[PDB]
């Protein structure tokens, strides 16, 4: 049953990945959440629900690039159930900001296991994947929402609906 | 807790619409799973991979034009788990096409069920929505699934692997 | 008589890229072989012969690759008699798809042990050439050449001469 | 007080970094020293006098990148001062090429131990950053650095005055 | 050792020179250190940041236009450390607004100090060539810095972090 | 087992050849050799370099081209082994020219032997197919090496490292 294609690809590699394929899927379910409550009558912040649809769609891109992935090396993949996010109601820019973060940080320190676990199988292809195509974007995703959150506490947010709204206006318009 | 935006719009209705949101992410994620099986080094047909990624992201699209409508009629997005998909191994294009066929008349039968709840609760502009977004979609999608289904059948699926191989060139490329 | 250059390398990296320099010449040889024998009178098939020809050029850029690597390190390059193919009479399409994904994992199997040997000898500028230019691309042809030798034996090759045909027009055409 | 973004982010690592930061800042000022003496009317080799100065600007932008990483991980920029070069005169062209290489050596080898530092702190981005950003830019402008000694050398400098001029419009023009 | 080309350029007004030169480094520096400081994660002012960068290659240019100048004369450039900057934390856009123009206002000093000496040395090119390129160009800097410092104030800064993220869109952006 | 195609194609044509072939690859081994010997750090003659690699790629269609001709004619290509090149170390640009220009006379030696052959077994064909695309090739090769032979000595190579250096830049770039 192994793949004619299969080369120096541990099955704990292969499990992890298909780890990794799920908690990818369920990030980009988060942001679609976190985007449509922006979308409310309610809250109505068109350029809050605009950056977080943007980051649910490029989580399912990296999803479907690990889907390749595995592929590539002859594993197969097994999908499991998507979780629904942990909130309904995201409160506020910052309070999904700084959830945002918390996810970010969180899917980065997956990357990071999966890495060693490259590193310790002696899977150098596999290692070389997650640092060219994982490692930095998450570096740069972390830095970014870092930035945001410090500008919205620094503007008065959550209590003043001004610093939102310039927010929204300013650095996501 | 009514949505200053909420007129002539039933609870019931709201409801429909947040099980139709999870049906549309879960025909997604059916047919992401059948686009990777395609991909694999032992199936190998690109064609059929491009075809089924393809409806895989439209069914996200549908999903979200429905997240827009409750949110534009003051309804609340309640999401829920993304079940995983019936099968991981799909057989053959022919097998999969025969499911996606059945996949996409369940979908239709939940939008029709939608569309008589509409109309049993006087509620035209969700009726109309219906039928200008979704059900001639869905027509025209089960139409095309059932051409496939016939040419494949006839060019001597699943049993000549010439048949799928000419039937992802000349139908699908 | 240490290059001036030189910062970091082993002797037995050196020798190693003198061996991985020898492999990449072998396999633009047979690949050239493979064109060839495509290109007759009886088996005329055009598309084949052309594949292996692109093949066998790309062969030779990665082993000139490598020339310029061991200069650019300060090594010496040591040239040995490039081995003849094991083969003058490849058989069918389906035949030296399966003998190339056998080279191809062969060489891949000498990147994955170049390698191994800079991360043991703590070269990493080393294990970042071969992971750049190498690992991947050795992957890809992995893939490529397991898709074509699983569409030509779910086609009917080699027994079926249509198979093969069709195949050279519609997969390498 | 430990940054809101910081992850797997080692105080050795950071500690190096702040280091690295000094030595490219360093490096910028040697060739600024080195472009501004060829430019002297008792030198008057303007070709040498612009070859320096763009090391000196990217030495300053390497320097600059090394700052960035630093910001986008959570560590803390501390500057220290940029000690003056270790000479005033160069004395040829031939001895300034030589002096570059010596520099360019130095700072490969503290790249080295950098890359060394994040392998033992489990650090797979700061690796990868000093991989990608780094050890091939330093390899190639030590095997340039080489041969222009080279080139000086066999064509008589720095006793041939002739010699310097005809590299300066051939090989710096 | 008196240059060939040297004509009515006193020794004290090449020794003016020199610390001149780094006086516009060390000014140089100080913008690189507050530019970094606005690109943290907890500062997170990205047009302050680049306000800033643009401040100290500006500086940097003017440094490279004395070097310039001490060679046309026939002086010798004898380049010192670079000290490191008084901060390492800016506090404010408001506080580095401030440092910098006071910065500046120190900077001119020393230029109108090295016109006097020219005045002074009968030396009207020196005297010519300070007032054409730096003279005006700091009275701009110091006018244009006190008009930021101002604006600041106003809006209130630097309490309200909600006035330097409006400076930094409206009049840096 | 005769060719279909086979017609006045006597099996002595058929195996000269199967050696030319061997011979012009052998030949593209040896230019490849003289090309990153001067690539190398000590040697750093970037127009040789590139010289021998263009002479080394020519070889190679020269070789591709005998192949086509064998297959036109119905002959069977028998591939021998490369041997590995007469020499690693080149000495000097004149010493590769020189050796270069008795390499291009050994070829034309064989074409001339194998065109005698041809003319001996009445096979027009052959004869014509020599004279159109490798007697004047070679005959041009040739008076070129002598030219730079020729050259080389009156500037004074190999002693003169000049020589070599103005040769490189003037008639080889
Ligand atoms: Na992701
Ligand atoms: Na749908
Ligand atoms: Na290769
Ligand atoms: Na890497
Ligand atoms: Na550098
Ligand atoms: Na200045
Ligand atoms: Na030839």
Redesign the pocket.
Known sequence: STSQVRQNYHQDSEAAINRQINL?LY?SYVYLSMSYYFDRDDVALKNFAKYFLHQSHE?RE?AEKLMKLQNQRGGRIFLQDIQKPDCDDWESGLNAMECALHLEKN?NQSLLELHKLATDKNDPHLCDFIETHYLNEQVKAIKELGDHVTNLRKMGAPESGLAEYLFDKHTLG
């Open positions: 990818e990030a989580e990296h899917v």
